[PDB]
From a paper:
Conversely, MAGE-D, -E, -F, -G, -H, -L and Necdin subfamilies are type II MAGEs that have broad expression in many tissues. Both type I and II MAGEs share a conserved domain known as the MAGE homology domain (MHD) involved in protein–protein interactions.
Thus, we expressed and purified the PCF11 degron sequence fused to the MAGE-A11 MHD (S218 to C-terminus) from bacteria and solved the crystal structure to 2.2 Å. However, the extreme C-terminal residues of MAGE-A11 formed three alpha-helices, whereas these residues are unstructured in MAGE-A3-MHD and MAGE-A4-MHD structures. I689 and L692 of PCF11 form a hydrophobic core with L273, L274, I317, M341, V337, I340, and L338 of MAGE-A11. Furthermore, disruption of the hydrophobic core of the MAGE-A11 SBC by I317R or M341R ablated PCF11 interaction in vitro and in cells.
Residue numbers in the entry: 680 to 697, 706 to 707, 1218 to 1424
The structure:
């Protein structure tokens, strides 16, 4: 599909409790996202001068917009943050969002970062009160085009990714629901999730996705303070 379509759908997904068009600027944002993904993989530094030279060229006057849109894509789609390390040379580095120690690449140049989807899953569990029926998780993920039993063009097979990979990584718990027979399944945060982030940091990420303040999620804000 399209990186920016999926970004738009991720912002919809986070509003579940309440479209990009093809032009030159769209192409310049995708090309920059590709360049930023290349630098992330080798922890390469990138400058504003490199971004102009290799991608922006004759759209220098749209640089602020293209960089902002590309930076939003890197975060919400790939869980990569763009951080300024030198204001004078306009030098930036690419690090994993919420400082998670996982991106699912594992020195593999096919693989797309999975930290974006991991943060969304942790968010959704949080959003449903820190324990979510499996079927409700799949319903919410359907909003961003992620489906159990279907190969996803960025993230691979989500059913295995959530119930296997992220259980073995201890980001998630996936278990039989107590009192159910025959058996239903639920997700919670795993111990690595609690060790690497907090409810309030995840609420801020969620809120920021749609330009909203965390306080505008009153129940989730109160739950995040209970920590």
């Amino acid at each position: 599909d399209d990186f920016l379509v999926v970004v738009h759908q991720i912002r919809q997904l986070f509003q579940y409790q309440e479209r990009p068009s093809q032009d030159i600027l769209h192409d310049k944002i995708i090309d920059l996202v590709h360049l930023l993904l290349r630098k992330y993989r080798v922890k390469g530094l990138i400058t504003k001068a490199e971004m102009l030279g290799s991608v922006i060229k004759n759209y220098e006057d749209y640089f602020p917009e293209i960089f902002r849109e590309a930076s939003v894509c890197m975060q919400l789609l790939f869980g990569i943050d763009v951080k300024e390390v030198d204001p004078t040379s306009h030098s930036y580095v690419l690090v994993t969002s919420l400082n998670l120690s996982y991106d699912g690449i594992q020195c593999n140049e096919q693989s797309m970062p999975k930290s974006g989807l991991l943060i969304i899953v942790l968010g959704v569990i949080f959003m449903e009160g820190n324990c979510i029926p499996e079927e409700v998780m799949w319903e919410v993920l359907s909003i961003m085009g992620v489906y159990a039993g279907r190969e996803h063009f960025l993230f691979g097979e989500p059913k295995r990714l959530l119930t296997q990979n992220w259980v073995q990584e201890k980001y998630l718990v996936y278990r039989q629901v107590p009192g159910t027979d025959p058996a239903c399944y639920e997700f919670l945060w795993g111990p690595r999730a609690h060790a690497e982030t907090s409810k309030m940091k995840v609420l801020e990420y969620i809120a920021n996705a749609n330009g909203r303040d965390p306080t505008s999620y009153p129940s989730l804000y109160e739950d995040a303070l209970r920590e």
